[PDB]
Design a protein around this ligand. Structure first.
Ligand code: 67N
Length: 102
């Protein structure tokens, strides 16, 4: 694997530690989130991000960060603010960018 893949695998491991329940581990299904696919146009999750690293689809750290932000923004769009998912998305968006900045 390439230096970028190694760095992104490291960032991904550290980001997933901030989601110990694995709420962001796999794509959101409509079965657990009614109507999700009809509301969220560009779904994202950590498992898809892992597959993109392995496929070498991220050509910059910026692209990886954009998928992480997309994942969090989706949760803050579909869910109401008084939900576990909204609250965690907001928390990990900020904490995750901080972690990747230094
Ligand atoms: C990320 N995520 C995971 C599960 C779920 C159920 C309702 N909303 C959500 C959500 O946003």
């Amino acid at each position: 694997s390439t230096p970028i893949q190694q760095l992104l695998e490291h960032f991904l491991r550290q980001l997933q530690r901030k989601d110990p329940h694995g709420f962001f581990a796999f794509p959101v299904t409509d079965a657990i989130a009614p109507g999700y696919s009809m509301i969220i146009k560009h779904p994202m999750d950590f498992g898809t991000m892992k597959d993109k690293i392995v496929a070498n689809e991220y050509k910059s750290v910026t692209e990886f960060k954009a998928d992480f932000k997309l994942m969090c923004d989706n949760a803050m769009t579909y869910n109401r603010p008084d939900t576990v998912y909204y609250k965690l998305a907001k928390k990990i968006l900020h904490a995750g960018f901080k972690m990747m900045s230094k």
